[PDB]
Amino acid sequence: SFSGYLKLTDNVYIKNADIVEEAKKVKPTVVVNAANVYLKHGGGVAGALNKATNNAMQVESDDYIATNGPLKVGGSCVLSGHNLAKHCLHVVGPNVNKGEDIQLLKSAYENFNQHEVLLAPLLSAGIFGADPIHSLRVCVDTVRTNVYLAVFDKNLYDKLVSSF
């Protein structure tokens, strides 16, 4: 059901798309959220995915944190995908704007290997402060399963594809 994606490697594909609209169209088995350790979905991809679930993702996340405590930077948890997907894999990449170690980005992408196919954003990009070209390079060199990347900004998408 994924269509209009450029092929980067044997297993990594990319599209200039709104990940919420892409999830509603495809209804994948797994959509990846670019989460923080507290699962507080305020801005960026996290806020957009939560808003499309009418806040059901945040209510479910708050119960998960109340039971288990916060995630590790580089870690993940599988929760419901609500109206967007069967499941949502909440992955925490390092937030470079908070002094988190960039080496944890490879650990964050290793979580994708537990799932055969994923619709995902670039981790640690945007408001997390890491270089998006570096995030795409770590993705290609780490993920072995089929990943379909959705990049919202047209100019960033063109730069990622021309510099790859």
Ligand SMILES: Cn1c(C(=O)O)c(NC(=O)c2ccc(NC(=O)NC3CC3)cc2)c2cccnc21
């Ligand atoms: C790299 N990046 C990305 C990205 O998705 O590539 C961000 N992504 C976003 O802000 C983002 C915002 C909105 C949506 N869609 C909807 O809300 N769609 C429903 C109305 C119909 C998806 C995503 C980002 C926000 C800060 C900084 N960098 C960002």
